[PDB]
Design an enzyme around this catalytic site. Structure first.
Site, PDB file in Angstrom:
ATOM      1  CG  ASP A  75      -3.601   4.522  -2.963  1.00  0.00           C
ATOM      2  OD1 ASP A  75      -2.772   3.674  -1.871  1.00  0.00           O
ATOM      3  OD2 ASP A  75      -4.393   5.087  -1.996  1.00  0.00           O
TER       4      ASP A  75
ATOM      5  CG  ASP B  37      -1.708   1.455   1.443  1.00  0.00           C
ATOM      6  OD1 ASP B  37      -2.518   1.920   0.274  1.00  0.00           O
ATOM      7  OD2 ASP B  37      -2.503   1.881   2.249  1.00  0.00           O
TER       8      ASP B  37
HETATM    9  C1  LIG Z   1      -9.663  -0.735   4.941  1.00  0.00           C
HETATM   10  C2  LIG Z   1      -9.878   0.779   6.090  1.00  0.00           C
HETATM   11  C3  LIG Z   1     -10.537  -0.262   7.683  1.00  0.00           C
HETATM   12  C4  LIG Z   1     -10.256   0.214   8.500  1.00  0.00           C
HETATM   13  C5  LIG Z   1      -8.648   1.108   9.114  1.00  0.00           C
HETATM   14  C6  LIG Z   1      -8.061   1.328   8.096  1.00  0.00           C
HETATM   15  C7  LIG Z   1      -8.290   1.071   6.881  1.00  0.00           C
HETATM   16  C8  LIG Z   1      -7.260   1.075   5.578  1.00  0.00           C
HETATM   17  C9  LIG Z   1      -6.421   0.782   5.321  1.00  0.00           C
HETATM   18  C10 LIG Z   1      -5.685   1.176   4.154  1.00  0.00           C
HETATM   19  C11 LIG Z   1      -5.475   2.319   3.287  1.00  0.00           C
HETATM   20  N1  LIG Z   1      -4.904   2.656   2.356  1.00  0.00           N
HETATM   21  C12 LIG Z   1      -5.139   3.388   1.431  1.00  0.00           C
HETATM   22  N2  LIG Z   1      -4.402   3.855   0.509  1.00  0.00           N
HETATM   23  C13 LIG Z   1      -6.346   4.185   1.429  1.00  0.00           C
HETATM   24  C14 LIG Z   1      -6.779   5.273   0.359  1.00  0.00           C
HETATM   25  C15 LIG Z   1      -6.428   6.539   0.605  1.00  0.00           C
HETATM   26  C16 LIG Z   1      -6.614   7.374  -0.723  1.00  0.00           C
HETATM   27  C17 LIG Z   1      -6.283   7.295   2.116  1.00  0.00           C
HETATM   28  O1  LIG Z   1      -6.845   7.767   2.381  1.00  0.00           O
HETATM   29  N3  LIG Z   1      -5.465   6.776   2.948  1.00  0.00           N
HETATM   30  C18 LIG Z   1      -5.148   7.328   4.622  1.00  0.00           C
HETATM   31  C19 LIG Z   1      -3.723   7.349   5.463  1.00  0.00           C
HETATM   32  C20 LIG Z   1      -3.668   7.639   5.964  1.00  0.00           C
HETATM   33  O2  LIG Z   1      -4.845   6.527   7.502  1.00  0.00           O
HETATM   34  C21 LIG Z   1      -5.893   6.300   6.339  1.00  0.00           C
HETATM   35  C22 LIG Z   1      -6.774   7.818   7.020  1.00  0.00           C
HETATM   36  C23 LIG Z   1      -6.575   4.493   7.356  1.00  0.00           C
HETATM   37  C24 LIG Z   1      -5.419   6.678   5.069  1.00  0.00           C
HETATM   38  C25 LIG Z   1      -7.201   3.902   2.360  1.00  0.00           C
HETATM   39  C26 LIG Z   1      -7.445   2.697   3.407  1.00  0.00           C
HETATM   40  C27 LIG Z   1      -7.853   2.652   4.590  1.00  0.00           C
END
Ligand SMILES: Cc1ccccc1-c1ccc2nc(N)c(C[C@@H](C)C(=O)N[C@@H]3CCOC(C)(C)C3)cc2c1
Length: 364
Positions: free
Chosen positions: A220, A34
């Site tokens: 991403d 990621d």
């Molecule tokens: C899907 C999920 C459920 C529960 C807690 C965390 C997540 C999660 C984990 C990894 C992620 N990785 C990603 N690249 C994304 C999409 C991107 C654009 C994003 O919003 N990233 C943020 C970076 C900081 O940490 C966050 C707020 C969990 C996601 C969303 C994600 C969400």
């Protein structure tokens, strides 16, 4: 680097994962790759969905940091306990590092039922790390503790299994054709870049380029879609609609919630993004096919609106070999040797172009 080729796996829509080991003796885990987060986090308890999990009791090199971490997302969460242990990547460089590991002990809508991964490798920078920027991300630890060059690259090949390569510490020139073109990492938190022009089948959308990067644009590997800011998405769709009004589609398919089955392809336009170059007033462009933004589920529409900014997810990355050149604060794009094309059009990376006022395109 031939040991690292084809080291990525996954199923359509459930992310790309790499095999890792944690602890001593080594415990094998599959780990989501990621570039849009910065934590190294793994299941550490017998959650029903999981094939396996980190068992700290079994590791002699494990150290407790005596600190918790709570990570909410727009939907659901994970939380865990911080510690360090020894980590390696079997089909990566032949080294071992002490790294931070979040042992996930409670989660909601994080793990996927039917998926074959048990954790996540956040490859982005410390500034977006949880709980704060003092938890050093895995890749920062790797570079600091070894002689691995501060660079990695991703060839995400897509299709039902998907495959790919994460070349850690370098570039494999057999994974792309033509030349790499580089855009600056605008700031080291996400892999933030600046889009300076958008073309739908050669047609400039004619928006103020600031709208393309409101409030950011990022690369991403953890996102499936090409994600566009609200105003840009509406303009973009209004244009893709018009470019392909030879056939009929419900207004919900662009939102996007229906199939279509057989393939013409050619009613749909190519999508071009121009990215800020290395030199003043110089840009280059990356072009994707409908093969990239029409995802099989018979197909679905893989461009969607966002209030987080532009997200260059798998839709984008599957057309290209992507170089995360951390040492030189830049990201490289070249045409992927594995991208899905037909015999008319292929994905492209082209330059140089003259673009003025590119620094105006970034949001403050
Ligand atoms: C899907 C999920 C459920 C529960 C807690 C965390 C997540 C999660 C984990 C990894 C992620 N990785 C990603 N690249 C994304 C999409 C991107 C654009 C994003 O919003 N990233 C943020 C970076 C900081 O940490 C966050 C707020 C969990 C996601 C969303 C994600 C969400």
């Amino acid at each position: 680097f031939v040991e690292m080729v084809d080291n990525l796996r996954g199923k359509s829509g459930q992310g790309y994962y790499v095999e890792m080991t944690v602890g001593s003796p080594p415990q094998t885990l599959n780990i989501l790759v990621d570039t849009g987060s910065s934590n190294f986090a793994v299941g550490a308890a017998p959650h029903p969905f999981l094939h396996r999990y980190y068992q700290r009791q079994l590791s002699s090199t494990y150290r407790d940091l005596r600190k918790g971490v709570y990570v909410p997302y727009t939907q659901g969460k994970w939380e865990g306990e911080l510690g360090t242990d020894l980590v390696s990547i079997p089909h990566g460089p032949n080294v071992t590092v002490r790294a931070n590991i979040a042992a996930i002990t409670e989660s909601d809508k994080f793990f996927i039922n039917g998926s074959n991964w048990e954790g996540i490798l956040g490859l982005a920078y410390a500034e977006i790390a949880r709980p704060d920027d003092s938890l050093e991300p895995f890749f920062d630890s790797l570079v600091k503790q070894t002689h691995v060059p501060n660079l990695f690259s991703l060839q995400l090949c897509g299709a039902a299994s998907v495959g790919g390569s994460m070349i850690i510490g370098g570039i494999d020139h057999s994974l792309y054709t033509g030349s790499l073109w580089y855009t600056p990492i605008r700031r080291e938190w996400y892999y933030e870049v600046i889009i300076v022009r958008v073309e739908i089948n050669g047609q400039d959308l004619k928006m103020d380029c600031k709208e393309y990067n409101y409030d950011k644009s990022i690369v991403d590997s953890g996102t499936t879609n090409l994600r566009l800011p609200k105003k840009v998405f509406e303009a973009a769709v209004k244009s893709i609609k018009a470019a392909s009004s030879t056939e009929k589609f419900p207004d919900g398919f662009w939102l996007g919630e229906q199939l279509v089955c057989w393939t013409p392809w050619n009613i749909f336009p190519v999508i071009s993004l121009y990215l800020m170059g290395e030199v003043t007033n110089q840009s280059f462009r990356i072009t994707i096919l409908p093969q990239q933004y029409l995802r099989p589920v018979c197909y679905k529409f893989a461009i969607s609106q966002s209030s987080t900014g532009t997200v260059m997810g798998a839709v984008i990355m599957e057309g290209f070999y992507v170089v995360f050149d951390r040492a030189r604060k830049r990201i490289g794009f070249a045409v992927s040797a594995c991208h899905v094309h037909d015999e008319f059009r292929t994905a492209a990376v082209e330059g140089p172009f003259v673009t003025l006022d590119m620094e105006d395109c970034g949001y403050n």
